[PDB]
Amino acid sequence: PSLAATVRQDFPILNQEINGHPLVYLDNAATSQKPRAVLEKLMHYYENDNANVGAHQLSVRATDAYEAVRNKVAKFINARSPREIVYTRNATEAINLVAYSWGMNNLKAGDEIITTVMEHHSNLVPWQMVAAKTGAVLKFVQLDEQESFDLEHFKTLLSEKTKLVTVVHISNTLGCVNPAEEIAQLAHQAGAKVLVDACQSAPHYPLDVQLIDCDWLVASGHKMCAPTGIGFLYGKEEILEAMPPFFGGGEMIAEVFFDHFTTGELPHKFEAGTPAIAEAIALGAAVDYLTDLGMENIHNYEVELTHYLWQGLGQIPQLRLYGPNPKHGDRAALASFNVAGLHASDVATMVDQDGIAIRSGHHCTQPLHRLFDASGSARASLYFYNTKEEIDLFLQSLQATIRFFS
Amino acid sequence: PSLAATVRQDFPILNQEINGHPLVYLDNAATSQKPRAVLEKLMHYYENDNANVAHQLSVRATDAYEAVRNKVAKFINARSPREIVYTRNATEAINLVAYSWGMNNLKAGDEIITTVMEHHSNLVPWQMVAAKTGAVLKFVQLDEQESFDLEHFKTLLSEKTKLVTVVHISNTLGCVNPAEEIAQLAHQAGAKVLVDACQSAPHYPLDVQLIDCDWLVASGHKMCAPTGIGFLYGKEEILEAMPPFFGGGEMIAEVFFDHFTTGELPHKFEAGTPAIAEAIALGAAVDYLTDLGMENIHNYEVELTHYLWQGLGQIPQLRLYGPNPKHGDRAALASFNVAGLHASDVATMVDQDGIAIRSGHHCTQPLHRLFDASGSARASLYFYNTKEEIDLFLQSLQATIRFFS
Numbered sequence: 041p042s043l044a045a046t047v048r049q050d051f052p053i054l055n056q057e058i059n060g061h062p063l064v065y066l067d068n069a070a071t072s073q074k075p076r077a078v079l080e081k082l083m084h085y086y087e088n089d090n091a092n093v094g095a096h097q098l099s100v101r102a103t104d105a106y107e108a109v110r111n112k113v114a115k116f117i118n119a120r121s122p123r124e125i126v127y128t129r130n131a132t133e134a135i136n137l138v139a140y141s142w143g144m145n146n147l148k149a150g151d152e153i154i155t156t157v158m159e160h161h162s163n164l165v166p167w168q169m170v171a172a173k174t175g176a177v178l179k180f181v182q183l184d185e186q187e188s189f190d191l192e193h194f195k196t197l198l199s200e201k202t203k204l205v206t207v208v209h210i211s212n213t214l215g216c217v218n219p220a221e222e223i224a225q226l227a228h229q230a231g232a233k234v235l236v237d238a239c240q241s242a243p244h245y246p247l248d249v250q251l252i253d254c255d256w257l258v259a260s261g262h263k264m265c266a267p268t269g270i271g272f273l274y275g276k277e278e279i280l281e282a283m284p285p286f287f288g289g290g291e292m293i294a295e296v297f298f299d300h301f302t303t304g305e306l307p308h309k310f311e312a313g314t315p316a317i318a319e320a321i322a323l324g325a326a327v328d329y330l331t332d333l334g335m336e337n338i339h340n341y342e343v344e345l346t347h348y349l350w351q352g353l354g355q356i357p358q359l360r361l362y363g364p365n366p367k368h369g370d371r372a373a374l375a376s377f378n379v380a381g382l383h384a385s386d387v388a389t390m391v392d393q394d395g396i397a398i399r400s401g402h403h404c405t406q407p408l409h410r411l412f413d414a415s416g417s418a419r420a421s422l423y424f425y426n427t428k429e430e431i432d433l434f435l436q437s438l439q440a441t442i443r444f445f446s
Numbered sequence: 447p448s449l450a451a452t453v454r455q456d457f458p459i460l461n462q463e464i465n466g467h468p469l470v471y472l473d474n475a476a477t478s479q480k481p482r483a484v485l486e487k488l489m490h491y492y493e494n495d496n497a498n499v500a501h502q503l504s505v506r507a508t509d510a511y512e513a514v515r516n517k518v519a520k521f522i523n524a525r526s527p528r529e530i531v532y533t534r535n536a537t538e539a540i541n542l543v544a545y546s547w548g549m550n551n552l553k554a555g556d557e558i559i560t561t562v563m564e565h566h567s568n569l570v571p572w573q574m575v576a577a578k579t580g581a582v583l584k585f586v587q588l589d590e591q592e593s594f595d596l597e598h599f600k601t602l603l604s605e606k607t608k609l610v611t612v613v614h615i616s617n618t619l620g621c622v623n624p625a626e627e628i629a630q631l632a633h634q635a636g637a638k639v640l641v642d643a644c645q646s647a648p649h650y651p652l653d654v655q656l657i658d659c660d661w662l663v664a665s666g667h668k669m670c671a672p673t674g675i676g677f678l679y680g681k682e683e684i685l686e687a688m689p690p691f692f693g694g695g696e697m698i699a700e701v702f703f704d705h706f707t708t709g710e711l712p713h714k715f716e717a718g719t720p721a722i723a724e725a726i727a728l729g730a731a732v733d734y735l736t737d738l739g740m741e742n743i744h745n746y747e748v749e750l751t752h753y754l755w756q757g758l759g760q761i762p763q764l765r766l767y768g769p770n771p772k773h774g775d776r777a778a779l780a781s782f783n784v785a786g787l788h789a790s791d792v793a794t795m796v797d798q799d800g801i802a803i804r805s806g807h808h809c810t811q812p813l814h815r816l817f818d819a820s821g822s823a824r825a826s827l828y829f830y831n832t833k834e835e836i837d838l839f840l841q842s843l844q845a846t847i848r849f850f851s
């Protein structure tokens with residue numbers, strides 16, 4: 041039995057019909073579905089332990105459960121210390137925290153920030169805000185012949201002015217896996233800091249922050265089987281220690297006087313106000329769930345699905361597939377594409393009639409799409425609960441859609 | 447049958463035993479418990495509609511999520527749902543105003559009036575703003591009933607007052623500050639006004655048009671909603687002029703390599719994937735509360751408040767902080783200290799009787815220094831609490847005093 045076959049019973053949302061057909065959820069790059077383990081953890085907390093994180097029993101229970109999550113996350117990405125993990129609402133907030141706390145205070149006029157043409161808006165806009173306020177300037181790494189990170193071009197962008205390199209780990213559109221470790225090596229040699237947007241890798245790819253040696257890394261819980269409302273920032277302790285606080289308020293202080301306040305120690309320093317307690321505990325359950333399956337196992341299964349998907353799409357003559365072909369190596373378990381003479385919106389709408397859920401649009405990578413004159417694109421994205429049978433249903437619906445518009 | 451008697455069955459967490467006794471949850475000012483209606487809403491979403499907010503699931507998730515904003519707008523009588531911005535908690539909401547408006551509208555010498563009773567979340571952000579802009583903080587003192595001293599507030603107003611930020615109802619003193627009059631006076635002085643309504647939103651009817659505050663913040667976890675969701679209310683004209691805070695997906699209109707354009711309100715201030723399920727749950731919380739009626743909730747809490755204070759006032763070893771409910775309307779809570787006994791020991795001991803209260807400074811450290819107290823014990827109620835529970839609390843407190851005598 042496939043990995044999916046063994047866990048699909050864990051996801052109640054998968055067992056339903058859409059427009060008369062069984063749901064085929066292929067929009068996992070947008071957000072993931074949740075297993076009972078996660079939902080029951082959420083319900084159990086609210087029905088038995090809910091209290092702020094105290095002398096009374098409920099507070100003790102809520103506090104123990106909540107505090108246990110940080111090390112689960114630290115171990116999940118192999119962080120040196122849980123003190124290097126900061127909870128946020130989502131990855132976007134995590135990137136903004138770095139931009140506002142570190143960026144606004146460490147970048148001066150003329151300083152260069154190297155990013156890529158494929159970035160998600162959340163790892164671009166914050167930097168455009170920083171640039172506008174500090175005078176820093178942005179440079180963009182182009183795509184290579186395999187529609188992936190152009191490492192040689194990246195090398196040409198490095199200079200004495202390079203102070204920050206912020207790049208997506210795995211593209212939510214192209215699906216290319218960027219050379220995070222080597223990028224960090226080259227950046228550090230140039231004297232720059234490196235932030236890695238791992239929203240698409242954290243849920244599908246084994247992560248080792250000590251190995252890639254990134255200075256910061258961000259991820260969103262909703263894409264890795266956790267509820268929305270929780271994400272996290274990973275930052276080298278020394279860097280977070282030097283960075284000034286961002287949000288101010290309860291819980292992030294040590295002492296407060298009318299005339300001044302002192303900041304608390306890491307990681308509390310960056311977490312203001314009552315945390316998303318239940319959501320954090322659920323994230324811990326998500327991490328536990330994924331670790332039990334094994335990230336290497338999840339990845340191996342996705343690789344199999346990825347080859348099947350691309351092989352099937354490659355046989356449809358009207359299709360243009362974006363990003364590197366699986367044959368060349370590791371890539372995301374997704375496929376973005378366009379059908380000649382047919383707008384992606386029509387493709388997405390029609391397959392939905394067969395119960396297939398895919399996404400059309402620019403996937404929050406408008407500059408990338410505009411750069412190659414693509415009026416958005418259709419994207420089918422997988423997770424470990426998807427099957428080859430579902431991919432076939434999708435391919436059949438797509439072929440039918442093409443017939444309809446022919 | 448009391449209001450509590452009619453709703454306690456809706457809260458599953460209340461039906462359990464702690465240390466051999468039925469749970470008596472009196473720490474609602476820290477966080478509230480949730481009714482089944484809210485928890486089922488959350489669970490239903492994840493088990494049926496979870497998707498980004500356009501295939502079927504996406505449509506269902508989007509319709510559910512979009513309906514929440516007007517529920518919140520109506521709950522506080524905002525003129526438009528475009529004036530409601532979702533945040534993780536009230537603290538984030540305050541920081542948003544501090545960074546977006548504060549850092550850009552306050553210059554050296556400008557004055558910010560706040561109070562000595564403020565929660566750290568409505569103080570630290572302004573200290574951060576003052577340190578960067580040169581703005582100066584002024585503090586309204588407590589009156590003889592340990593409440594907002596309106597006369598002193600008037601003496602602080604000057605041609606330099608640009609911002610007045612005050613708590614509506616103190617989480618420590620329980621005093622109800624005259625928000626409407628404070629706003630009227632501040633505006634006449636040419637200043638903007640932010641009201642921290644974290645303790646009023648869950649217990650007291652709110653009307654931002656009547657109060658005429660420029661911004662108002664609240665936390666969902668204190669008003670029967672999940673943790674992870676809160677909101678900022680802001681007069682549309684002010685939010686329209688305020689520059690974006692967080693940048694990223696969802697808050698833009700268009701993004702180019704060299705610049706971006708911002709989306710319209712309220713999207714302008716919500717970056718990245720929102721807390722979808724949690725917002726939908728907040729909507730259920732608002733509906734639940736509205737069904738009960740905030741005025742009815744308030745009326746019941748007032749009844750419990752007199753009962754609580756009469757009982758506590760009759761224990762000689764106690765020092766109660768804030769206005770007596772017979773001095774004026776106040777919050778359904780009581781912060782106090784037992785002579786010669788640390789609040790932590792009091793909280794720890796009543797917990798042995800299954801009673802849950804809080805000790806510490808409740809994030810109002812500066813305030814506690816004024817009473818030469820490192821902290822205080824606080825029993826805080828909600829509409830599912832009863833007079834019987836208050837009596838159990840009083841008996842446990844008396845027993846605790848005997849233990850340490």
Ligand SMILES: CCCCCCCC(=O)O[C@@H]1[C@@H](O)[C@@H](O[C@]2(CO)O[C@H](CO)[C@@H](O)[C@@H]2O)O[C@H](CO)[C@H]1O
Nearest residue numbers: 183184185186187362363376408409412414416417
């Ligand atoms: C959905 C939005 C993203 C679309 C991304 C399209 C990327 C793309 O067009 O990039 C080209 C890449 O295909 C490749 O181009 C060709 C044809 O495949 O291959 C050679 C170079 O080997 C070119 O002569 C040819 O156009 O390489 C281009 C240069 O790196 C790259 O821009």
Ligand SMILES: *Cc1c(COP(=O)(O)O)cnc(C)c1O
Nearest residue numbers: 313314535536537565617644665
């Ligand atoms: C509880 C409380 C807050 C808390 O904000 P959170 O962000 O929920 O932690 C702020 N102000 C007052 C008056 C409060 O009672």
Ligand SMILES: *Cc1c(COP(=O)(O)O)cnc(C)c1O
Nearest residue numbers: 130131132160212239260718719
């Ligand atoms: C989904 C996505 C994000 C999103 O951030 P959120 O805050 O969860 O909306 C950022 N970067 C990439 C590469 C993504 O795929």
